[PDB]
Amino acid sequence: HHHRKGIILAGGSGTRLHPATLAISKQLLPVYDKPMIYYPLSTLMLAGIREILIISTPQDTPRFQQLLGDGSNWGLDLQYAVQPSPDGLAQAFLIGESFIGNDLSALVLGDNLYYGHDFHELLGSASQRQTGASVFAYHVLDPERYGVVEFDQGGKAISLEEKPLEPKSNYAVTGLYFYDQQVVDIARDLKPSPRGELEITDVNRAYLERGQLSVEIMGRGYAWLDTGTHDSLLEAGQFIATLENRQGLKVACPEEIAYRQKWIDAAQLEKLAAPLAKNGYGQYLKRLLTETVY
Amino acid sequence: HHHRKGIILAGGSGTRLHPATLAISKQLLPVYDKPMIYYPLSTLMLAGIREILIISTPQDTPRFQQLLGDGSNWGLDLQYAVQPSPDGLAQAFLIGESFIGNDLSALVLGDNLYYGHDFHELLGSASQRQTGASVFAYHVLDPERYGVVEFDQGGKAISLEEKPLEPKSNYAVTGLYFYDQQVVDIARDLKPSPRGELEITDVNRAYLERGQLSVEIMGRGYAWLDTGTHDSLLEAGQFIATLENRQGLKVACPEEIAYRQKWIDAAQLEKLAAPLAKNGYGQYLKRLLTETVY
Amino acid sequence: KRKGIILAGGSGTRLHPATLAISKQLLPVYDKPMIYYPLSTLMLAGIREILIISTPQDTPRFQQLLGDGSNWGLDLQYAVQPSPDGLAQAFLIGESFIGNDLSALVLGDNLYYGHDFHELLGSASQRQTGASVFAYHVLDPERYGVVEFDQGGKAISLEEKPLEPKSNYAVTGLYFYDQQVVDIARDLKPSPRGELEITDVNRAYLERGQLSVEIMGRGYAWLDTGTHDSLLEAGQFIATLENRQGLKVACPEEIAYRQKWIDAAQLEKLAAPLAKNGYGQYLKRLLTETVY
Amino acid sequence: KRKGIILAGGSGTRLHPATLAISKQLLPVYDKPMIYYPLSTLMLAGIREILIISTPQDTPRFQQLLGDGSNWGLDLQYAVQPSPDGLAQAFLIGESFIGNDLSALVLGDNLYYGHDFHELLGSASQRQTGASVFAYHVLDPERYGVVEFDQGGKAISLEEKPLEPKSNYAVTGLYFYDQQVVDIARDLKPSPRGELEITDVNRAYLERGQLSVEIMGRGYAWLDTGTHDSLLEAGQFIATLENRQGLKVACPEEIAYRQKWIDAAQLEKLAAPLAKNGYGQYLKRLLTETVY
Numbered sequence A, B: 001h002h003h004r005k006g007i008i009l010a011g012g013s014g015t016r017l018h019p020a021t022l023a024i025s026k027q028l029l030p031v032y033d034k035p036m037i038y039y040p041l042s043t044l045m046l047a048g049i050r051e052i053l054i055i056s057t058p059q060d061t062p063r064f065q066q067l068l069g070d071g072s073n074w075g076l077d078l079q080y081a082v083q084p085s086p087d088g089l090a091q092a093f094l095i096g097e098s099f100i101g102n103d104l105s106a107l108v109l110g111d112n113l114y115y116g117h118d119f120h121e122l123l124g125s126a127s128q129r130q131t132g133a134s135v136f137a138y139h140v141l142d143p144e145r146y147g148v149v150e151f152d153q154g155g156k157a158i159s160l161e162e163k164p165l166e167p168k169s170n171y172a173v174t175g176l177y178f179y180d181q182q183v184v185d186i187a188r189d190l191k192p193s194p195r196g197e198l199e200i201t202d203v204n205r206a207y208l209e210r211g212q213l214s215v216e217i218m219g220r221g222y223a224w225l226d227t228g229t230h231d232s233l234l235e236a237g238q239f240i241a242t243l244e245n246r247q248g249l250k251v252a253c254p255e256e257i258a259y260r261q262k263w264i265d266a267a268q269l270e271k272l273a274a275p276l277a278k279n280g281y282g283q284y285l286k287r288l289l290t291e292t293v294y
Numbered sequence C, D: 001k002r003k004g005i006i007l008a009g010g011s012g013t014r015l016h017p018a019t020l021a022i023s024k025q026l027l028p029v030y031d032k033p034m035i036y037y038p039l040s041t042l043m044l045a046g047i048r049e050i051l052i053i054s055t056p057q058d059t060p061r062f063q064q065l066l067g068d069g070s071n072w073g074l075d076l077q078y079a080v081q082p083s084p085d086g087l088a089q090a091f092l093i094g095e096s097f098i099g100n101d102l103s104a105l106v107l108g109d110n111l112y113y114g115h116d117f118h119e120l121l122g123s124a125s126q127r128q129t130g131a132s133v134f135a136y137h138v139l140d141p142e143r144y145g146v147v148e149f150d151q152g153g154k155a156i157s158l159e160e161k162p163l164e165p166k167s168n169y170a171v172t173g174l175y176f177y178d179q180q181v182v183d184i185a186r187d188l189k190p191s192p193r194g195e196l197e198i199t200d201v202n203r204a205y206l207e208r209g210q211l212s213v214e215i216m217g218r219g220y221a222w223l224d225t226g227t228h229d230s231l232l233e234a235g236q237f238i239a240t241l242e243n244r245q246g247l248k249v250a251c252p253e254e255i256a257y258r259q260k261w262i263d264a265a266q267l268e269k270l271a272a273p274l275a276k277n278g279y280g281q282y283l284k285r286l287l288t289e290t291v292y
């Protein structure tokens, strides 16, 4: 008788971006002024998630651990798992099964950057849906590269296709997914696609066929940035730099997000600022203590 | 017995950006794939404003007229005035006095670019306030360069200062202003500041002292882009290019905004596409006829 | 004596609406009008007498920008190209300007940068007979005049926008000609696309073994201004060089002064109007600083 | 025989958190690890025997990346610098590697580009006595070793990060030395900031009239990797060159192959693992294409 956790998939991108990524995983590469993984981590945090599993290669887990620790500095609890071989995104749920337990979950890709107004509220809406799965659809130039969602005249999602040659719309599914307690069992019964991968689109189609997939539009006023190529990586750095140098505010500073969620107080933030007091990042953390930012 | 119009200030930026701007006004320079003036024009249009006065130098008015015409192609009515000498932003209301008549108004700077989610609704809120004046405050790195707003502990605006050496906050007033029928008379009684200029901050302080200035925060999730330097111009081009190449959607395409406001129909948009059918811009206009974009 | 021509004519509707109000070559690349860059190139090549060819609409604009040239030690003239009917029209339009002198054409939207560019130009300019062009390795040779070389490195063919390019070597927008070019241009027939082709002019020199094709090495930057994306990149490229160095690329006043076409007192007068911005400050600092 | 050293040591906490997980010199600049660029520079200078010096933590990472060098016709060795105690420590750490040979140090985060760079390096490398450095005009000379010249153009002083720089000419991160440098390094005292200064090594050669200071001209790009903004720019600069040209900057496999240190069949083996991305495709295309 019986009476939301986060996952960040930051494993191998294979040899796709070699030789740039020969010495280090993509998700530890900087995007402008901070490691890439700070952005998806900050995203889960904005969604109010505090218990988070980082999935990386066996080779780079210690590097993630060194950067991020156990989370206690930022009011989180961070755990780690390895993905020996990159057998697909849906594998996150088998690797993370004991971590998830009987809870709701959120999966984010470790190389996905988001930006925009009321992003907190867009994340809240998905996080509040305690049943079913929630994903986001975003208009892209190149829907071929993604899971593509087709809508009917009423705006209802009626199909999902993984990397179709002739996409039914320009609406790609973003690398951010919210799931109720059915996801582990759905993942467990997945059979490898032709490429040997356990596909997240198959997971989302399972929910769709059950009438339990909410697809919310992430509007054109949001930036969902591309890190798939060297070119798009560079554009992602330039995009963040322009916003931060314009505003005097950072995007996805995890210390700041914890501070504003009240997961850490002013004294704790002051201590985090000390080691970096001579660079712009530590000076930014110090300015958060006295400035009112709306 | 007696029983909202837009202005775009696109006059002289002086010799500040010479020699780049020796042959042509700044507001006709491209930002990535379209003239700069398309962005503030699109902004007024998003606010639902259809009667718009463009203020330029006598030298470049014909160039604006050639680019934009009388508005009829886009469901607008565009008129023109000249600013013989750049005697300040508040001069817009004396130059535009007969154009404004007895109506409410909106002033936008011809070199200001905005971007973000629910921008339409942020513009709507200001446009709906039929009394008083409405402005926007945005957090910037360099508030010294702008009109700066100071808030009290409750978030109420309590002072405005033009280019203070020691800014009371990092909140700059953006170059977008909504005004009731009192603005022309307020402008008329302005005395030149020490620099010989008729200051918009003095106009906004007049409303503030009357308790009729609404200052809404434009959040950090919006991009209010800088075009003040060659560097910031270049960053503005890069910023737009990244969004448009990512999305397959344009920012501030005026034809598109008219189409979506129902100011022009599909047949009219088809005709606008014809002359540019061989380039990306005309091909974009054609794709708007058949695609559903949420 | 070698005369210069800059062809800054119409690029059609390809970059519209960005270029609806104004010719591309009057638009800035970072901190200065695009035409400063090819103008600076002719000046570096030692050319002082220069004809600028533009659309009828925009010739007043180039004129008010650049003047008769005298304040920079140049002698500038202007002419119009009514319609975009081929780069070779420059020699028809420019026939009486050229007269019996040597000539050099540069395209108004072409940007160059690199070490010893002066000597690369100086060598081509010194060759008093035949014609000299430059071949540059590019990713997309179909867009250009493509030069094919034999195993010995000799140029053996030229094709204008081939469907199947023979190499990745594009001819750049910089051409030096002897006294034969006008007469060769006058006998050109329009191509199938309806243009008087510069590549037909160059093939005429090639058939007589009088086309010197120099490699512009990979250490030189020949930047692309043909698309919006490429305009932007060119701006970022110049900005990175100038902000790194504290030195400008293709500042005509500097080049005049370094060629000794204007003296210290004239450079000082030029600085006066712009004194309150970076460009005039730059010009002032060139008076007292030794730059190697 | 001239030996090479690359100093790819710790840059402290200056770029943290971006460099918290990994040394800057193992981070990409556009399409390849930053250290490919100074490695490619030594190889272009003709240097095959090369010592890479890094933090104790990251030496395994440079090792697994670069191997013993044999697949690129190089002979690579590795050594650690326990603490960031000055660039001159390279010659102490590298003393037994150098032995009685000539040497050249390049900083692991310095990027160069330009025409005839090979000959600029080749000339310095050929000078068998004394030391050769390069002076480059920059906007912010206070950040560097600043060289002052007399009216005749002779170097007369060197200052490390002067408060009031004497010129705008910075010494770049590329240094060639004769057999004297180790012994000069061994006698260095720590500076006031607590470091063994490369500028004190260079001043020692200067006092004996044995410092050749060559101008690296404004036609060369010496790119800045010291700030986040400057990392980004360097990436945009390399991307613009490579996408324009269809040719890569500082591809070590290409440089080996062009120096004839590996043959056509070895380059082909190298291409195999990367065949499905741009980098391996590039290597394959170098087999059949003549590039001048």
Ligand SMILES: CCCCn1c(N)c(N(C)S(=O)(=O)c2ccccc2)c(=O)[nH]c1=O
Binding pocket: A039, A042, A043, A046, A114, A115, A116, A117, A118, A119, A120, A250, A251, A252, A253, A256, A257, A260, A261, B220, B221
């Ligand atoms: C709850 C505090 C939100 C303020 N905020 C913010 N809106 C942002 N954004 C710009 S964001 O909501 O779009 C965002 C937040 C986390 C990760 C990526 C974007 C941010 O990066 N950091 C912040 O502290």
Ligand SMILES: CCCCn1c(N)c(N(C)S(=O)(=O)c2ccccc2)c(=O)[nH]c1=O
Binding pocket: A220, A221, B039, B042, B043, B046, B114, B115, B116, B117, B118, B119, B120, B250, B251, B252, B253, B256, B257, B260, B261
């Ligand atoms: C009413 C149709 C709005 C859709 N839209 C849009 N949201 C935008 N934006 C990205 S925006 O609301 O931020 C905007 C609109 C006009 C000018 C600048 C930004 C746009 O540029 N063009 C559009 O057609």
Ligand SMILES: CCCCn1c(N)c(N(C)S(=O)(=O)c2ccccc2)c(=O)[nH]c1=O
Binding pocket: C037, C040, C041, C044, C112, C113, C114, C115, C117, C118, C248, C249, C250, C251, C254, C255, C258, C259, D218, D219
């Ligand atoms: C005779 C003056 C040469 C120095 N020089 C120079 N080399 C350059 N170059 C960087 S350049 O030779 O590559 C060049 C010159 C004119 C136009 C484009 C590039 C320059 O822009 N301005 C200069 O004064």
Ligand SMILES: CCCCn1c(N)c(N(C)S(=O)(=O)c2ccccc2)c(=O)[nH]c1=O
Binding pocket: C218, C219, D037, D040, D041, D044, D112, D113, D114, D115, D117, D118, D248, D249, D250, D251, D254, D255, D258, D259
């Ligand atoms: C002997 C091979 C020289 C051709 N070359 C070259 N010039 C360059 N350059 C662009 S470079 O000389 O300026 C250079 C070379 C190594 C590292 C940095 C720049 C190159 O990157 N790769 C090459 O194969």
Ligand SMILES: [Cl-]
Binding pocket: A218, A219, A220, A221, A222, B116, B117, B118
């Ligand atoms: Cl939106």
Ligand SMILES: [Cl-]
Binding pocket: A116, A117, A118, B218, B219, B220, B221, B222
């Ligand atoms: Cl916001």
Ligand SMILES: [Cl-]
Binding pocket: C216, C217, C218, C219, C220, D114, D115, D116
């Ligand atoms: Cl070269």
Ligand SMILES: [Cl-]
Binding pocket: C114, C115, C116, D216, D217, D218, D219, D220
């Ligand atoms: Cl040079």
